[model samples]
Target chain A: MAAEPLTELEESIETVVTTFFTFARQEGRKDSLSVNEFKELVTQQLPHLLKDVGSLDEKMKSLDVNQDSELKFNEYWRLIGELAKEIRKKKDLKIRKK
Target chain B: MAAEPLTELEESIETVVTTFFTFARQEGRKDSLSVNEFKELVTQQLPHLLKDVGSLDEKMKSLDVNQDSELKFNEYWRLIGELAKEIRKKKDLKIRKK
Candidate 1:
């Protein structure tokens, strides 16, 4: 659908989606993330963003809404959504002071 | 929260969050997006991803879950989530063939 080059924002969006597949494909069910895959993703890709989240296991359990021990695309998206909201909160405060 | 540099995926997530504020601050409500702001965002930043979505007005209406005619961060995040899912579908097909 993209005959022309994607804008920076579009590239960013694609990168987010591609990163999910990159890690998800490392184990069973290429469409979702296993515990090890999730850990690697968080450790390598989300080190800074998820530093204070404490336990990856607990975080994964909370995000694995269906108790499947694996995170589907929707579940993974929610994690990113939560991070985005956190970032938004900080940006909101910063912008309001301007 | 980021003492260390962000990885590519983390940077992509940050870019997605920052782009929202960049356009959102152009007019009303620095934290949310007005109709005009949303349109500009779609037209410029999301041109490739949203090319097939007819009628930005209707799209905005559907995304404006609060029905306040402005899109909050969560609402905007949902839009990105939808686009990411669509990309996932395409990627899913491509990966299964490999």
Candidate 2:
């Protein structure tokens, strides 16, 4: 049977998940930012999300935990997870914040 | 308008979805996961990716209709979607586990 209709929140998550998959499939470099690919993934997939989070340098520092410069599967994965959780926090607090 | 960045855990989930999508889309011996291909994808995509409390054999037994080790796109996709739900439950409970 078809599942119940998704809530607005679920749609947001599906967009988040699908976009991440589409971008990761794109080829990127072995070492460092592969800045072009990185920008492409973020700009396209996260157009309405994760836009402003301070310096890219800080984001990179948090992401490249192993100092591998390159974003291996784990690093990239961790980055997106962080983005999702943070979004949840702000959204949940929007009522209180405003 | 801009959004936010991902947190470590949410990024990890994005990694999970993307890596799974890439390998799941590959031209395996089967349309889905081939023999070695399935093993490799599971190991690489899921290094502590979604290690929940369940028997692997029982999990596959639930999926393999013909009882062949092979899996098709629907089969693999269903497998992962289920895993995603399962992981979210217990892992989120981890903090509550304490």
Candidate 3:
């Protein structure tokens, strides 16, 4: 529908980025989420999906490249993209199973 | 993980709002999408989900309260939320039917 300026879109984007990274900073690492912080964020925000994997730690390890143990914006984005693809993944899996 | 300023979040939100409105405007309605535009959008972006409803027109009519046949941004947002909630709906129905 025709609407006013794109205010909400800007606001929603800011909300997503601002919240989790703030938690990440609380873990004393200003660049990304520590193990605990990451776990907390996922458990809190990704309850429905994350629980299915049964190996959240391994997923975290792979995302936290460089072994430095912190996740930057790119890493966080990649994780979301991965989680977001659940819909597409399920579709593909069904076809394969068939 | 600690990251820099919240640039990406802001940008993603802006991108979502901007892209949809841009398409909406192409239909000559600066505030919303016309009936044809709406159908085209659902067909293009929501092939799987929207089709099963068997009555997108009713959904559209409900959203366009004024009945002018154009959907504004908030209407579109509600539509997406409805679709997104499909995941939750499926779970709820499974529980109930069981």
Candidate 4:
């Protein structure tokens, strides 16, 4: 729906947001992710990055700051930020070594 | 650096983080993004998404919450989250119409 083509970073940002809705729409509230949806997203999309995050249930619980069980977009965004931070850590180390 | 191939979402996340480092390393500090780097990132990568944000200088000032004139990873991540939130608003409207 955008008038102009998206840049690489723009497209990536869109992909991240779209992924959340794609799963959120599968059940319950269309704007938030349910427990099953969260699990599936981690299982399919974050397989490698979040492999060491232990239990998905625990992860979900930690992210559900409001204790609402369902994950809102902000909550999901925080999760993505956490993942990005982990990647940034590695990238930072690599850059420093250079 | 990953053992297994990254999924589309994982790759997108990597792209987002990598974009920051790509620009951040251009001058001064190797980690945080200076004003010039932030401006370049907006000009090159966020052209469409951030077009209506008025002045990039003001935007940078607002994002630079610490008033350091440099944006750390957390600040950059927050910007990405804001952009994703905008996209989410549009997507939410479209999904409701369907």
Candidate 5:
């Protein structure tokens, strides 16, 4: 049987997952992000989406919930979740204003 | 300043958010997914990704939290978050097996 192609949403999910592992494997532990890795990932991958946010330092600190200076996958997922929610809120406000 | 192109991760995030609203708007509520809309969304947009999952009815019920049969943005986000985490686990296992 022929393999099916991933749907648009599935591709998006894979992009998010693969992007995280790629950066996390750059140095130290392969399962988590050191501060530098997090900074690079945010600056390069989140350029436009994170532009309005404050410093990357603050964002990293907020997401490193364990206080170990290493962010796990859950933390990264939480950060993206927050951004997605923020986008939805801003869009909702814009629709209301229109 | 010229607008910068969104990175892959940003585009992925936008895909998830927009997909929800596009489907949610198809039915009664513009901000939430009714059961029918949810079914259509999972079948079409999540075809490959959700194929291994059990029943859509149980999944929907678990995520609906409020028993309203309409899923809000937060609920949808949570579902995707769980799926992303599940994929991460499977990939990690595959890597370990090698």
Candidate 6:
């Protein structure tokens, strides 16, 4: 490659960043996710990963922290981090099962 | 799509998870990144994203909430979250400039 392509991890990081903006820009403020947009984002982008997570509304409330209806970048990132942690545990169990 | 491809966001989340395990498996514990592995991870996987963050040692200390030299999966995820947030800000600025 003339210019090196992004590593898998780098591309993944960009995917997370771009997806947040994609939803945030669709409704209300371009910088935050209204309740509806958040639901759409999770259902469309995180279907499998967040399936076990309870209702998106309840999860949003728990993560909102300030009772705000909008989900900011920080809040959204933290939510993903929470899910990643859960996946990590499940992966560990699988490895041990093998 | 036969079974539907993984969404960009889902792929990214898995990238983060798998990358951590990949490095963790390389060094001690097989579940956390020793300091050296952590350095290699950042330099190799996060070259562009983490370039602005200074001093990996200081970065590790702040993220290492437990003060342990080994960085657990959660700690590493949080660090990536921070970088993601920064990238989000820069991206927003770029959009406004356009």
DockQ of each: 0.40, 0.04, 0.05, 0.41, 0.37, 0.37
Ranking of predictions according to DockQ? 4, 1, 6, 5, 3, 2
What's the alpha carbon RMSD for model 4? Answer: 4.5
- lDDT by residue for model 5 (B1-98), tens: 11122567766766676666755677766656676766777666565555444477666766778777677766665676656654444444334421
Q: What is the TM-score of each candidate against the true structure?
A: 0.72, 0.35, 0.40, 0.72, 0.69, 0.73
Alpha-carbon local distance difference test for all models: 0.62, 0.44, 0.48, 0.62, 0.60, 0.60
Q: Please write out the lDDT profile of model 6 over residues B1-98, one tens digit for every residue.
A: 00122566666666565656654676666656676766777777676656554577667766678877777766666676666654445444334331
Docking class of 2: incorrect
lDDT per residue (tens digit) for residues A5-97 in model 6: 266766666666565665467665565667666676667667675655446666676667775667775666667675565444534433433
**Residue B83's lDDT in candidate 5:** 60
Ranking by TM-score: 6, 4, 1, 5, 3, 2
Per-residue error at B78 for model 4, in Å?
Answer: 1.5
**TM-score (C-alpha) between model 5 and the true structure:** 0.69
Per-residue CA lDDT of model 3 for B3-96, tens digit only, reads 1122443344334445556666776545455667667655665444333444676577667666655666445544544442332232443343
Highest-scoring model, TM-score: 6
lDDT of 4 by residue, A1-98 (tens): 22122677777767765656654677766667676667776776676666454576655766788877777767776776667655535454444331
* Residue A1, candidate 4: C-alpha displacement in angstroms: 9.8
2 or 4, greater by DockQ: 4
Badly placed stretches (over 4 Å) of model 3 are A1-6, A51-53, A87-98, B1-98
Sorted into a CAPRI-style docking class, model 1 comes out as acceptable
Give residue B6's lDDT in candidate 4 (0 to 100): 61
Top candidate (lDDT): 4
Which residue ranges in model 6 land beyond 4 Å of their true spot? A1-7, A56-58, A90-98, B1-7, B90-98
TM-score of chain A of 5: 0.63
Candidate 2: regions farther than 4 A off: A1-23, A26-35, A51-54, A91-98, B1-52, B55-98
Candidate 2, residue B62: CA error in Å?
28
